[PDB]
Symmetry: D3
Subunit: 146 residues, 6 copies
């Protein structure tokens, strides 16, 4: 209902000019944008985001890639937005999805979306302050929802 | 076989959100032929009759004037395996209409006939014979 | 003022080339409201009557059954300055319908009313009152 | 140079789901996104933004509309970004943002700085230095 | 690696104006165009192209159709270009080329190599070494 | 009627992946593709194409830019195709046109089209052999033409 998910355009996605395309696909799907910003992660921000991988191999490489350039951070609100968000991104990813259309390699997969409600609020709280999150009314809300 | 027809309707939410042209465009690019088209706000009786098969369900009244709460766009498309292709185009995974544009089952933007059986019914229900234009498109030998 | 209406028709070449959905989509995205819609193959008399003002020109017969040579899609759109906006959308420089899709004046894909005067005529000609759906879209206070 | 312009999607544009489309058109043009955020302006912010128009009779309406809902604030960097930004927005012609999506001047979907002067003002008003990303596009020698 | 696949727009795809759309989808995916040409295959060329299917009863029809009009021959370079090419073409699902534009298997708009093996065969058959461009995309380290 | 024009995607246009977009816009306009190829111009090809500028300043720079990477050569056939081609490309170029949508600088204007029937056949004969030009029937020809 008031469910939220975190979406980020990775540096390859920003550099290739795919920011607008991604935002548009979420909008046309009927979801509500409530937070948005662009920034180049510091080493520690990159580390924190990928903290779960601190025991995983090549973590420094991941950290220095993610911090090598600007990302676009988003929060989207709506029913099943976490699940639909992953679906919109894709995986073997299929055309019609973001990765299906624009990405070839896993290391260059354009974008990230939270894999769960668990993960989303963690990622959201990490990247955004409460005041950065807009609260507003979609005029189309009951044409999208029952 | 290329005389097969399917019924497609853009639901009030689909009309409201301006997705009529997009949907029509997706059928045209697929290579199908438009033979009937109209917009109307369904009456209660039209809404009931269309959903005649659901008249015993508890959500029938809710479904009935949602459907008559605003305009729908009615279409008939003609071509080989158009009934199935219609369902495929609707979706749900991205690339399809519902996959691209819809979130809720009660708000799934669009409807398509689920079978040739249903297709003949729905078309006959919403359109009279004189409303169905029959014509031959010049790309027929490029598509089929 | 937001009750202004214009008449738009996709010509047989436009239908033939699958540009109906695209054209409808361009009007929707502009923020205009679809209130009437139908497809038909014009009869000779319908073609003559529509082009009544051109009945004294040497190319009238040629123009008349080209127009009845195949199906057209008839539309009515409602909204502020829609007559003018319709002409603007049609075009010719790129970004407009004729600018994007057309090469020949005799094959200019689409027609729009050139004035409010003409608009009332064309709509009344092609559509009866019961065919015009009147409804209020939820984005009306976002567009106007 | 590293010229910058301020672009804001007004509340109707956000509500109508036009943010991504607009961002895309700037990206496709080859300009560089260096700042981005979404917020609902306070009355005080809207007045400050429209400072130059405070003696105009339609100033109050501008203030209530701009503060009536969320906007998306952007800064774009590149040669002629101020002028090209204005050109992209668009008496607007199809192909442009207002040409494609807007009908009335009070709901013209989007705003861009009218000058470099206005740009630095607008940028300084809406963004702190810390919010502006500095980076180099890999495509820079393909664009300039 | 510098893996290559052969892509051909079949005569219906060319006739239906789908060449640019297809080329675009490969470009948007991040693959590199290294060879490109348009020609109408001779009967002898079509037979050679469909060499592996010469024992199939629908082989003759394939030969006459493929030689019935102009095709666009392409070579694309990049990692998994053979598989991704097949995935992009598409029981085909919307979002794919055949899913979006084709209805029947005999007029499925486009062809892609089914394997690296087939790719080198197809490439060597249709193109001379002199026709293949060698170049580096500036976006290569953004894609791979 | 059987008028032809020469269209080339410049190296910036190829590199930015705008080849398909340009071809599509000509196709949707209703014009007929009759010749197509991709190549990186040699110095002499670049020189010959810009021969009219041999007395013009900075000619070597133009020559080494044009020969610095691959271009896509096209020939399109149809009524007023030379004039319509320039219109589709644009100039101060307006949105809806190729340059209006994708180009910022004159030195990076994505694409070239012949400025006259004069120029078109010169450019065509220069870049294409007779056998490279396909002769074929658009099935939509009389839906486009009277």
């Amino acid at each position: 209902s008031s469910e939220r998910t975190f979406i980020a355009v990775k540096p390859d996605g920003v550099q290739r000019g795919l920011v607008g395309e991604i935002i548009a696909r979420f909008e046309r799907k009927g979801y509500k944008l409530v937070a948005l910003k662009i920034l180049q992660p510091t080493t520690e921000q990159a580390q924190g985001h990928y903290k779960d991988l601190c025991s995983k191999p090549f973590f420094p490489a991941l950290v220095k890639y993610f911090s090598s350039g600007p990302i676009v951070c988003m929060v989207w609100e709506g029913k099943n937005v976490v699940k639909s968000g992953r679906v919109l991104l894709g995986a073997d990813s299929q055309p019609g999805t973001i990765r299906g259309d624009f990405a070839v390699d896993v290391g260059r997969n354009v974008c990230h979306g939270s894999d769960s409600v668990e993960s989303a609020e963690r990622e959201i709280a990490f990247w955004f302050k409460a005041d950065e999150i807009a609260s507003w009314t979609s005029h189309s809300v009951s044409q999208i929802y029952e």
